[PDB]
Amino acid sequence: RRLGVMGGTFDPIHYGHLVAASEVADLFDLDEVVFVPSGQPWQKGRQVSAAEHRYLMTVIATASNPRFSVSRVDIDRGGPTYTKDTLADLHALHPDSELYFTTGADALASIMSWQGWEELFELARFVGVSRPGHITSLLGQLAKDALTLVEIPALAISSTDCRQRAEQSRPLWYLMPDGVVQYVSKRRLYT
C-alpha cells in the first residue's frame, strides 16, 4: 500500500496542486493522497493565512475526490512544521503504507539544504513537482529511487499569482475550484 503526502501551505490551494497530486498518484500507483497543510513554516518569508483558513480551503478543494483527504497533523502539532515530524506522525497513523512525500521542487530543495535528508529518506520516497521549465548527476548521487522530479504544466498556476489577483480584484475562476474562489472572497482572505 502506497500513500502520497502532499505538503504545502496551500495559501491558496489551486488546480496546479490538484493536478500535481493526481498525476503523482497515477505515476507511482498511490492508493490515496493525504494533503497536509502546514502549521507554521520555519522557512523565512511571508506570513501565511490563519491555519484554519488554509485547512478549510484544502478540505473544500479535495472533498469530491474519493482518493484525497486532508490531515491536521501539522496544524495541531504546535510550533514550526518540520517534514520529519509530519512523516513520523503519518507513519504512526498508516503503519503499513510506503509514504511518498510530494511538494514543490523549490520548497523541497530548501528543506534538504536546511534540514538534511538522510533521516527523511529513511521515512519516505520524495517527489518534487516543478513548473514547466548537471542536476541529473546530482540526482544520481542520491539513494536509488529516493527522489524523483516531475514536471507539471498546470503548476504554471501559482499561489502567488492567485493572491495578487485577489488583492487586485481580478477573477480567480477556473484557476481553483469554485468553492475555494468563493471562500477566498467571502472570508476576504487576500486584501
Q: Is cis: bond before 66, omega within 30 of 0?
A: no
Cβ proximity to Na ion: between 144 and 186 the closer is: 144
Residue tagged 520516497 (cell numbers)? 125
Closest C-alpha to 15, from 182, 173, 151, 186: 173
Contact map string, positions 159 to 178, toward its own copies, x by CB under 8 A: --x--------xx-xxx--x
| Stretch of residues binding Cl ion (CB under 5 A), selected from 27-35, 40-48, 73-81, 152-160 | 152-160
Residue tagged 502520497 (cell numbers)? 4
Position with the least CB separation from ligand E9A: 109
Binds its own copies (CB under 8 A): choice among 26, 29, 96, 118: 26
Work out whether 45 is an interface residue with its own copies (CB under 8 A): no
| Stretch of residues binding its own copies (CB under 8 A), selected from 12-20, 71-79, 101-109, 139-147 | 12-20
The span from the CA of 173 to the CA of 171, in Å, is: 6
Q: How many residues does the chain have?
A: 191
- Asked if residue 130 lies in contact with residue 104, where contact means CB atoms within 8 angstroms, the answer is yes
Work out whether 149 is an interface residue with its own copies (CB under 8 A): no
Single-letter residue type at 98: E
Q: Which residues bind its own copies (CB under 8 A)?
A: 15, 18-19, 22-23, 25-26, 64-65, 131-132, 153-154, 156-158, 161, 170-171, 173-175, 178
